[PDB]
Every structure is written in C-alpha cells, then in structure tokens.
C-alpha cells in the first residue's frame, strides 16, 4: 500500500459471507451507452467490481442477464427507460442519480439510473462506495443530488511546478511534456475527484502567472481539460488582473477602459477555442500585492463584471475572492465585510464571491465570515483549506472534517433560525442562483498525493461535504477509513475518534480560547507568538493577541473595533456578553484580565496553560491509539504514520513550550506545579524558531542558513 490509489482501493471484500452475497447479486455489468463519460463509468465499475468481488466482471451491451448491475439514463439505456421512473428521476436533476435493487422483465437487477451521463458516473462511484464500505445491497433504494452547483478544488501551483503551501510534492502538471504526454496520472486525478462528485478544478496559483493565458500554455492546459472532461470536471484558471499589460498589449488594466474590455473578450474567445466547456476564472485581486481594479481607482464590482462580460457568451463564471484586507484599517477582522458589503447587488449574475470560512486566514479556529450572513443579493461560495498550511504541513495528523462541519453547521441567524452557513451556501437563505464550495488541496507528485496519509481524509471529507453540506465529519471518516484501511469495527472506532480529535488537538497546542495567528512568519510551520516589527502590523502575532501584564485578547465589541456589529443581532449579542460568548472563541472579541475565571474554575492564565498542555496530551494519546492498530494496517503505512506522529509530538511540545513560555514572559505568572516545566527558557525556543528546518520546498525559510 503506497497510497497512490487513495480511497479507491478495489481489493477483495475481507468478510467472506458478505463477499458471497455481493457475488450472487452482481454477476454481470450491463452498459448500453458509449459516450466518453458512460465509458469512464463502465471502466470504473469494471475495475472496481472485478477487484472487490474477486472475479472478472466485464461491461457488455447484451440481452439482459439475471443478477446484473445495469447503468444508464432513459436516453441511452432502453432497460432503464422501461422502468418508467418518471418523477423519481425528475427530482435528481442534472447531476443526481438513483441506486435501486429492482426487476426488469423478471430479471433481478441493481440499477444506477440518472438523467445525465455524469449522474450515472457519480452514481457508479456511490455504488462502489457501498461495497467498499460493506453496505448491504438487498432492498437498496436511494437517490442523491448534489446540494451545491460548483464543487471545485484549488491548486496553488506555480508554473515552475513548486506549489505554494504545498507539502505533497511538485505540481502534478508536467508542462515540459504537455500537451504531447497524456500521463495516466492526469486520469487518476480525475477519477479521485469525480469519485467525490467534484466537478471543477482551478489548477494554478491565485498569485497568478499571466503565462497561463498564452497560447503556449493554453495548448497544454487543453490537454489536461481533455483528460478531465469525461469525468465531468471543468477547467478553471486563476488570472492576473494586469494580464493586458503583462502581454504588452495594453498600457493599462483599468476595467473601464474599452481596450482592456476587448482584450479580455478576445482572450476568452481564445481560451474557448481550445476548451469549449471552460469553467471560468478564479481571481485574487488587490490583495497581498496582487494587482486589481483598486490599482486603477476602480472597485471590485467593476473589475469582476468586466471579466464576467468576457465570459458570459461562453457560459463562463468568475469566482472573485473576498480575501482582501488593506494594511491601514483598524482591524483586519473587519476587512472583507467592509470591502464587499457596499457592493452587494452590484455584481453580475455570473460572478460568485468566494469567501474563506473565517475573516482572517484559515486559522485553526475562526468565527464565520460575516459576509456569509450579510450579502443578500450576491452569489457566494465557500473556500476551505485542506493543505495543512496552519495544521502542520505534512508531518502533523489533522483531519479537517470537524473544521468543515463546524463551519457548515454554524447558525448565523441571518434570516431566522436555520440560517446555517450550509443553508446559506445552498442558496435557500438569500435565494441566489450559483452556489459552491472550493477546497485548497495542494497535492503533488508524492506517491500518495498528499504527503501525510491523513491529508487524504481531509480531501475526502471536503468533497463529500461539497456534495451534501450536512454530511458529518464522523460519517466521512467512517467511509474513508473503510475505503482506505480496513472494515474491522475494532479498528474503525478508535481511529475515527483519533481523527475526530486531531483538529482540536491542533487548536490546543497552537492557539486555543480564541487566540490566533501565532505562527512563524511567513512560512507558518512553527510557533512564533512574539512576532512583531513586520512591514505590516496585521502580519504579526502581537497584533492579534495583544497580551500584556494585565490581560490578553482583542476587543471587537462596541467598546473596541465593533466588528461584532458586522454580524446579525443575535450573534452580536451572544458573543458580546461574557456570560454567553463561547470560550472557544472568547479572545477573538474580548480583552480579558488574566484573573477572569473560566467555566472550568481556572483563571484565564491557568486555562491557557491547561489547553496548551492538553493539545500535547491529545497527540500522545493519538500515538498510543495508532500503536494499537498494528494488526489492521499494512506494515508500510503503519510505520509511516507511527513515525509522523513522533515528529508531530516533538513539534507539539515545541509549540506548547514556546507559547506557554512566551505568554509567561508577558503575564509574569508561574506555570502550575502539576505540569511538566520546560527545562529551557524562552530564548532557547526563539533560537529553535530560527533554526528548526521548515519542511516545504516553496517558502524561503526552508533555504534559511541561520544557525544561531
């Protein structure tokens, strides 16, 4: 097991009784259709069923045989049409499917039926998943349709093939051999994403390289798009707003300039000549030095609409990111909301505002982005991070399922109860037309795609949740563990629980209680809560925690930055009252004295220390849990996760020690005697922050030769 297949491991069902049952139920595979998508579905079922059932199952178009799996649409499979499914199929729409044990002219069958070929493909992957997870096929009757329209992944890949916030190898796209070499891996990539119903990919870095729009690169990108197409995945690109200038064609990029408007229109024509079903653009503009409309004194609606007008005749969309924050504002937390709220309703209908889960930057825990509850006349979509920029690169185990779930199930009270982020995204709250979720996965050429085996689980959960935003982290983990490792109940329970606690452990040893942004800058591997004196205050650590001899936290109430007023009244009220604010968010909104007593009875200093120590204990507990699973996992992956957990434990101790000693140096309070006292001082951990290897090719810190 080297992880290349990820969760698509088509190995024989271990339970012999169950295996026999599947073998009796699926003896033949009937596929009448022959489109590229149907053919991809057939191919998947062929390899999948043959592997899982340990017998040769070949897709055929022949007179129906007893005990068949029959796939298709009423349009491409008369057998499916003969069942007269009607209203049952109607509700599935353009991407849904029905899986059902039934009969066709006295023959026993299980059907995968849909209105479209892609629906048949998604349904075929679910059929496989049921077997992979050892679910019974007898009396099967289920239907599913995706709840969001655009279910995409994002890749922060540079054209040199180094991935920004990439801990899993080089970029998968081998530009030197494209378009000539259609690598099998491109197809496998497509299979992985389609197995989750993911229908879009943005392949290049948001810090965008204008070369992706040149003929040279469009020919290469088109070959990729060709490989992704049968799997229902549309191609999207991040764009550099200053492209007209970069190409040397226009002396400005001002979106109101007719020459600029024409340049993008002509470029869209060029793109669509190569890729007739091209999805559209992802845009990082006027943010962190990336160009944009504000550079020409224009607003983001003006910029977005100009791009949207170029894509409109071809059916393309603009995913415009809300990740924008100016250095001179009082509070970064307020940034995106204050930038975009005045523009609500000014964006064209093929513009969707892509918003991170929280208002800062993918930190271990953030409150929901106020924009989700405030924009009522603009299409929105969620942006989640899978790559572990802030959860420990490829060395820490951190299932992100619980972060995604927490976000998606968060009540916002935007329009009554039930205004959850997931319901907002689905478009039911504000009644919008284009919906979605984007996941920054940043995989690479490493054999297992993700570096750390458990990053696979985060990609998995992301895709499942993009399909149904009410799917729990537990459910996703249960499926993933079964598909990736084992169906043994004794393995599944403790490993699932271990997965489920991993996120919270990562909050605890880094920045609990509402603390945030305590990372080494700008690599983000290790602790640096002392960070100050950077060109912009909002890049530092002290800006966020504001720790002093008397207290800690950031006042976002009416007496502080008043960011709570950007939220619906019930949220402002709950978080602004010390009696009701969740402790897991408290320091986001309140600057509190160290003697403030927490629910546990500890003062805030004591609680801080307790949480940091708890995170390390949670990792140590994960280590023990993992060790108890040796009999259920292959030797290689077992050894690899065991070793990574040792690195994680070492780093978690460094995090704990660095933070606790730092905050001690500011508060002047002792670490309670029952905890293990760090043997070294704060300077030693500052030295370690300067010298501990940063394991990521992209960030300059990995090349740092500092040795003191």
Instruction: Please tell me whether 383 is known to bind a ligand.
Output: yes
Separation of alpha carbons 14 and 42, rounded Å: 24
Residues 234-273 as x/- pattern, contact with its own copies by CB under 8 A: ------------xxx-------------------------
Residue 239's beta-bridge partner residues?
283
User: Is 650 annotated to bind ligand?
Assistant: no
79 binds its own copies (CB under 8 A): no
Q: Provide the minimum distance between the beta carbon of 331 and its own copies in the complex, in angstroms, as a whole number.
A: 35
Count of beta carbons in the 10 Å neighbourhood of residue 28: 19
207 marked as binding residue: yes
C-alpha 419/C-alpha 596 separation (Å) is 33
Could you count the other beta carbons within 10 Å of the beta carbon of residue 24? 11
Closer Cβ to ligand BDP, 384 or 399, answer by number:
384
Q: Between 158 and 562, name the residue whose CB sits nearer to its own copies.
A: 158
For the window 676-695, what string marks contact with its own copies as x by the rule CB under 8 A?
---------------xxx-x
211 binds, among its own copies, Co ion, ligand BDP, none (CB under 5 to 8 A by kind): its own copies
Query: Contacting its own copies (CB under 8 A), which of 26, 394, 609, 633?
Result: 394
How far apart CA 691 and CA 704 sit, in angstroms, is 8
Q: Which is nearer to ligand BDP, 100 or 361 (CB)?
A: 361
Residue 626, marked binder: no
The verdict on whether omega for the bond into residue 522 sits within 30 degrees of 0, i.e. cis, is yes
**Residue that the structure tokens 């006295």 belong to:** 106
Specify the DSSP class assigned to residue 578: T
The answer to whether 320 and 283 are in contact (CB under 8 A) is yes
Q: Given 361, 538, 651, 696, which residue is catalytic?
A: 361
The annotation status of 434 as a binding-site residue, yes or no, is no
Token pair belonging to 257: 């300039």
Q: Which residues bind ligand BDP (CB under 6 A)?
A: 164-165, 206-207, 284, 323, 361-362, 389
> What is the C-alpha separation between 342 and 133, in angstroms, rounded?
48
Please report whether residue 646 would count as binding its own copies according to CB under 8 A: yes
DSSP 672: P
Is residue 88 packed enough to be buried (19+ CB in 10 Å), middle (13-18) or exposed (0-12)? Answer: middle
In the shown chain, the binding pattern of residues 417 to 456 toward Co ion, with x for contact by CB under 5 A and - for none, equals -------------------------------x----x---
26 vs 58, 127, 206, 563, CA distance in Å? Answer: 11, 11, 46, 58
> Of 339, 389, 468, 523, which one is the catalytic site residue?
389
* Cβ closest to Co ion, residue 244 vs residue 551: 551
Structure tokens at 339: 């930038």
Residues 524/395, Cβ–Cβ less than 8 Å: no
Q: Is 104 in the site for its own copies (CB under 8 A)?
A: no
Site for its own copies contains 207 (CB under 8 A): no
Which of 631, 479, 467 lies closest to 131, judged by CA?
479
Residue with tokens 């020919």: 219
27: tokens are 């003896």
How many residues sit close enough to its own copies to count as binding (CB under 8 A)?
Answer: 49
User: Following DSSP, what letter does each residue of 137-190 receive, concatenated?
Assistant: -TT-EEEE--S-SEEEEE--B-TTSPBTT--S-S-S--TTTTTT---HHHHHHH
CB of 646 to its own copies, least distance (A): 5
Strand (E) or helix (H) holding 504:
helix 489-508
Among 36, 91, 94, 181, binds its own copies (CB under 8 A): 181
Residue 389 is a catalytic residue: yes
Rounded to an integer, what distance in angstroms lies between the CA atom of residue 215 and that of residue 284?
22
The catalytic residue among 61, 62, 75, 288 is: 288
| Out of 82, 141, 177, 600, the residue judged to bind its own copies by CB under 8 A | 177
CA 674 to chain centre: 39
Residue 3 touches which of Co ion, ligand BDP, its own copies, none (Cβ within 5-8 Å per kind): Co ion
Decide: is 214 part of the binding site for Co ion (CB under 5 A). no
Q: What residues form the annotated binding site for substrate?
A: 164-165, 284, 321, 332, 356, 383, 517, 539
Residues that bind its own copies in the complex, under the rule CB under 8 A: 158-162, 169-170, 174-177, 180-184, 209-211, 214, 216-217, 246-248, 393-395, 445-447, 636, 639-640, 643-644, 646-647, 691-693, 695-697, 702-703, 705, 707-708
Q: What residues form the annotated binding site?
A: 164-165, 207, 284, 321, 332, 356, 383, 517, 539
Residues that bind Co ion in the complex, under the rule CB under 5 A: 3, 158, 162, 448, 453, 498, 605, 621-622, 625, 669
Catalytic residues: 288, 361, 389
């Amino acid at each position: 097991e080297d992880g290349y297949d990820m969760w698509l491991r088509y190995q024989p069902i271990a339970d012999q009784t169950l295996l026999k049952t599947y073998q009796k139920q699926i003896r033949h595979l009937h596929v009448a259709g022959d489109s590229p998508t149907i053919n991809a579905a057939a191919a998947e079922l062929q390899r999948g069923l043959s592997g899982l059932l340990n017998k040769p199952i070949v897709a055929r178009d022949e007179k129906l045989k007893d005990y068949s799996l029959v796939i298709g649409t009423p349009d491409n499979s008369p057998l499916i049409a003969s069942l007269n499914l009607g209203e049952r199929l109607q509700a599935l729409g353009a991407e849904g499917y029905l899986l059902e044990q039934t009969r066709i002219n006295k023959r026993h069958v299980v059907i995968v039926a849909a209105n479209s070929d892609v629906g048949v493909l998604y349904g075929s992957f679910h059929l496989l998943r049921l077997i992979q997870t050892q679910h019974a096929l007898e009396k099967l009757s289920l239907s599913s349709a995706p709840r969001l329209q655009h279910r995409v992944v994002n890749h922060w890949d540079n054209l040199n093939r180094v991935v920004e916030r990439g801990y899993a190898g080089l970029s998968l796209w081998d530009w030197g051999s494209l378009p000539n070499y259609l690598a099998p891996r491109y197809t496998d990539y497509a299979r992985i994403n389609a197995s989750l119903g993911i229908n879009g990919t943005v392949i290049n870095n948001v810090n965008a390289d204008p070369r992706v729009l040149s003929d040279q690169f469009l020919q290469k990108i088109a070959a990729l798009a060709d490989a992704f197409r049968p799997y229902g995945i549309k191609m999207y690109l991040s764009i550099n707003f200053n492209s007209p200038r970069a190409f040397g064609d226009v002396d400005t990029a001002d979106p109101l300039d007719p020459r600029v408007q024409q340049w993008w229109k002509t470029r869209a024509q060029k793109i669509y000549s190569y890729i007739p079903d091209f999805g559209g653009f992802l845009v990082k503009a006027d943010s962190e030095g990336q160009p944009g409309p504000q550079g020409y004194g224009r607003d983001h609606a003006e910029g977005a609409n100009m791009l949207a007008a170029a894509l409109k005749p071809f059916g393309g969309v603009v995913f415009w990111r809300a990740f924008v924050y100016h250095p001179d504002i009082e509070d970064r937390f307020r940034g995106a909301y204050d930038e975009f709220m005045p523009l609500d309703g000014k964006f064209a209908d093929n513009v969707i505002l892509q918003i991170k889960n929280g208002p800062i930057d993918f930190q271990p825990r953030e409150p929901f982005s106020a924009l989700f509850a405030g924009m009522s006349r603009t299409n929105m979509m969620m942006e989640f991070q899978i790559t572990q920029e802030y959860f420990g690169f490829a060395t820490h185990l951190a299932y992100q399922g619980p972060l995604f779930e927490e976000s998606l199930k968060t009540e916002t009270h935007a329009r009554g109860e039930g205004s959850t982020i997931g319901n907002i995204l689905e478009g039911k709250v504000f009644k919008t037309r284009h919906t979605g979720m984007a996941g920054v996965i940043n995989p690479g050429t490493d054999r297992n795609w993700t570096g750390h085996p458990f990053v696979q689980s985060s990609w998995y959960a992301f895709g499942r949740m993009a399909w149904d935003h009410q799917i729990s982290a537990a459910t996703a983990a249960d499926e993933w563990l079964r598909m990736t490792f084992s169906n043994q109940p004794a393995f599944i329970e403790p490993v699932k629980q271990m997965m489920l606690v991993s996120r919270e452990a990562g909050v605890n040893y880094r920045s609990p209680l509402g603390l945030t942004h305590l990372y080494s800058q700008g690599d983000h591997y290790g602790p640096a809560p002392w960070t100050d004196d950077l060109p912009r205050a909002d890049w530092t650590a002290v800006y966020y925690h504001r720790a002093s001899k008397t207290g800690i936290g950031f006042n976002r109430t009416k007496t502080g930055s008043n960011a709570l007023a950007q939220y619906p009244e019930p949220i402002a009220k709950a978080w602004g009252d010390l009696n009701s604010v969740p402790e897991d968010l408290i320091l986001w909104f309140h600057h509190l004295s160290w003697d403030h007593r927490m629910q546990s009875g500890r003062n805030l200093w004591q609680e801080l220390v307790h949480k940091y120590y708890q995170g390390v204990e949670q990792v140590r507990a994960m280590q023990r849990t993992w060790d108890q699973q040796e009999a259920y996992v292959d030797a290689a992956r077992f050894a690899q996760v065991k070793a990574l957990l040792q690195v994680q434990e070492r780093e978690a101790v460094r995090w704990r020690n660095s933070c606790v000693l730092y905050f001690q140096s500011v508060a002047g309070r002792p670490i309670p005697a029952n905890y293990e006292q760090p043997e070294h001082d704060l300077e030693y951990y500052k030295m370690l922050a300067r010298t501990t290897y940063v394991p990521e090719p992209w960030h300059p810190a990995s090349s740092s030769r500092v040795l003191k």
